[PDB]
Design a protein around this ligand. Structure first.
Ligand SMILES: Cn1c(=O)ccn([C@@H]2O[C@H](COS(=O)(=O)NC(=O)[C@@H](N)CO)[C@@H](O)[C@H]2O)c1=O
Ligand SMILES: Cn1c(=O)ccn([C@@H]2O[C@H](COS(=O)(=O)NC(=O)[C@@H](N)CO)[C@@H](O)[C@H]2O)c1=O
Ligand code: NA
Ligand code: NA
Ligand code: NA
Ligand code: NA
Ligand code: NA
Ligand code: NA
Lengths: 454, 456
């Protein structure tokens, strides 16, 4: 499953999607292609259900005839009119009951063959529909800036700290001069491009950030969550876009699995097929994992890195998820303030948003030696988009309920991308002697106040 | 390279290896098979060197004759006695100079063909020699118990705490009742068999153990080391036996790589092609990594787990590595004593040792509800076995040093400090009450001062 079809079948709903597509500078005609694919699919289903019912009538009519000792009949040959009627979904049970046992047996096999063919057609139409749904963006929030390009289109909403100060050495030079980061051929000849070894004080800093970040979220009511780092193909497909398989995900062979690019992937997948009748309190998770990205200088952009993640599952009602999005970006802001790191928060323009996000805020920290704002955090409200894909339902779940389906809302937000935060700390806390440890991290690394240049 | 050939070429050295093979219940005949392959290899090299010199004589002779403007000659045919002589390694330079330019050009090509043929033979002999070397165990320490079966053959060296203690619930039952571990189909249908999710207090305990273990080693002079979790095929081959690729290692495709089974693999590989003239102080690394094992209830035996590792690179002289082995097992013991976990330390029997280990100590903690000693730690002295494979040299080079007749290699050791999920299982059984799991005192500052994690 990719998206629920329900909004596409509704005239008003389809227009909401077309409008959102236009506002994202995406194709509104994808809605119409989905409606058409679904129309063809609904036709295979109408015929399948009609023919399944007629198969049961054949079985019951044969049973009645056998009990009555009616002769089996002259022939099994099916009238062309009967074949035309079941192919068009107009064959009535009263007409089927006019056939002899031999014809009823032949018809049951013919209808079973038709159901088998219609199932193959339906599977192809579901594949076409699903491929189109992957190109449908989530319905934009009304506050999303309307623009194609990030450089001019994104809106700066807040800033913190000294964002104009400059510094001498960039994070690459600092980590080299500490003697605590190795990205030389000794490492890349054994592990490939962009691989690294961290030593001594930088490992202590890495662990101090992992533990401080986890405690920061525990204090805010998040439940720590340590996931498996592998996901099977089917499950990864529900939490990843098709473009992620070719550009971002490593394949593991032990069956075929994929390494996770973020704990958001197994946390969202952990909710698949779930149904929360009510969520008076949201589900809040502090994901902790290594992240693996194929990405097809230093430790700013690497294939392997730790990240502490915020993940929320909440009620889709009363715009509650929008309140959670504000709390999640505020949490990431408070985290950076606690580390004394200057930054700006940016509202991502419509054209730059990934399909699952209805709105996204990035926190870009100031790197004084690099002289630039660099992304440390992304916080998104995915509303019911991922829930539709993992099939995470919401609402009353009682016996006797017939065919609007409600889904939970889901949000995800970086709390700390460990290696990038280390790069940021190094630039902001450098001195002539080394790197000053931010105050809040000192208890998490044996009270160490500074890591020295070698 | 698998092993250096030098000890096999020495009569005393070959006898030391045959004895060690017998004491490990391995084949001593492998030594003799290696000697024979190397004898055939040395013959290909003798002929190669002789023929390379003759190729240079051909080049020099063609040069001198052409500078003197001599005619090319009437034939390129090589006298049968010349072909017989170079094939036997007896062709003299004086016989070569007597040939004309045309014959010298033909001979240089024929000798180059012979060198190409001899290189193919040498490569086939190197493959044969290396395959045999993979079945040669490291020279056993004289204190290793001689037995084939781990079940009855290991020797108990030391015990700590109440190793007869009994408890109510096993680690699986405890982690289930805490509501902090999920090994159900909600996880296994996502990530395959033996996959798990940890939540809440158990993740806090997991992080507390990682951080306390790292600090425990920093305080003991180890340098923290965070490695890449991938190794390419060639490099993994130097730090893993062929049986590990089949049974233990996941393959990753992004240039084919392998997920590490332990930080011991990238730390050993990080020393490939290195040469230390002296190691007055050893290199001590505190490896920190996730570990991935194919393994072809609960979180005791899983594919994915954190482990804090001790790794030492030291001088091969004066049996210094044997002192480090004792320090490393003592470090793992002091760690488990600080957590208050009862255990026994065993000296692994000869038949159970992996090929790289000259000796191994396991620390098996007592699980009071399970009612069994269960391996938490392995500490091994690999002496120069892994160093020969990664080519990590020590001391003076052979040339220009009259006193140096042997190629020296560093010694390497590795030892678990903390296998995080198994230690969590042990803590749960040992610290359970009717309300939940008491946090060992030393870990409380590493998990927000929490004294107990409660049953759901
Ligand atoms: C080292 N490194 C990279 O090479 C690439 C990205 N990042 C940081 O990861 C943060 C989160 O990545 S994301 O923007 O794709 N969003 C997620 O994964 C969501 N689940 C929310 O976390 C980025 O903001 C980069 O700072 C690295 O650190
Ligand atoms: C969860 N789990 C496993 O499933 C398998 C093993 N272990 C622990 O890892 C320790 C070290 O593994 S080892 O014996 O193969 N030795 C090494 O890897 C060396 N580098 C020394 O660490 C074992 O003692 C198990 O307790 C798991 O925890
Ligand atoms: Na820079
Ligand atoms: Na981002
Ligand atoms: Na006892
Ligand atoms: Na048990
Ligand atoms: Na072991
Ligand atoms: Na010498």
């Amino acid at each position: 499953m990719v998206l629920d079809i329900q909004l596409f079948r509704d005239e008003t709903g389809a227009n909401i999607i077309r409008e959102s597509q236009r506002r994202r500078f995406a194709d509104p005609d994808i809605v119409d292609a989905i409606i058409e694919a679904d129309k063809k699919w609904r036709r295979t289903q109408f015929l399948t259900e009609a023919s399944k019912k007629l198969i049961n009538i054949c079985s019951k009519a044969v049973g009645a005839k056998k009990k009555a000792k009616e002769a089996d009949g002259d022939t099994s040959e099916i009238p062309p009119q009967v074949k035309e009627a079941y192919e068009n979904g107009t064959l009535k049970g009263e007409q089927v009951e006019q056939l002899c046992v031999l014809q009823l047996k032949q018809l049951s096999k013919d209808l079973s063959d038709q159901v088998a063919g219609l199932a193959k057609e339906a599977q192809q139409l579901e594949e076409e529909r699903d491929k189109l749904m992957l190109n449908v963006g989530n319905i934009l929030h009304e506050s999303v800036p309307i623009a194609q390009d990030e450089e001019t289109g994104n809106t700066v909403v807040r800033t913190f700290g000294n964002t104009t100060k400059r510094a001498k050495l960039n994070h690459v030079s600092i980590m080299e001069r500490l003697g605590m980061m190795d990205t030389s051929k000794a490492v890349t000849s054994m592990a490939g491009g962009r691989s690294y070894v961290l030593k001594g004080g930088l490992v202590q800093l890495q662990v101090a950030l992992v533990s401080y970040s986890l405690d920061f979220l525990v204090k805010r009511g998040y439940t720590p969550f340590y996931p498996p780092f592998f996901l099977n193909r089917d499950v990864m497909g529900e939490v990843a876009q098709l473009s992620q398989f070719d550009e971002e995900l490593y394949q593991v062979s032990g069956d075929k699995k994929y390494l996770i690019a973020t704990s958001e992937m197994p946390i969202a997948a952990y909710h698949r097929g779930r149904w929360f009748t009510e969520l008076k309190e949201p589900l809040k998770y502090a994901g902790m994992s290594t992240c693996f990205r194929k990405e097809a200088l230093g430790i700013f952009r690497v294939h392997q890195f730790d990240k502490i993640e915020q993940f929320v599952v909440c009620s889709p009602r009363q715009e509650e998820s929008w309140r959670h999005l504000e709390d999640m970006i505020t949490t990431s802001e408070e985290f950076n303030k606690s580390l004394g790191l200057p930054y700006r928060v940016v509202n991502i323009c419509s054209g730059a948003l990934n399909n699952a996000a209805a709105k996204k805020y990035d926190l870009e920290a100031w790197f004084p030696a690099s002289g630039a704002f660099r992304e440390l955090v992304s916080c998104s409200n995915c509303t019911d988009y991922q829930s539709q894909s993992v099939n995470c339902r919401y609402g009353p779940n009682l016996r006797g309920t017939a065919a609007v389906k409600e889904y939970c809302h889901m949000l995800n937000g970086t709390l700390c991308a460990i290696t990038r935060t280390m790069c940021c700390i190094c630039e902001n806390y450098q001195t002539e002697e080394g790197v000053v440890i931010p105050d809040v991290l000192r208890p998490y690394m044996m009270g160490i106040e500074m890591i020295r240049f070698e």
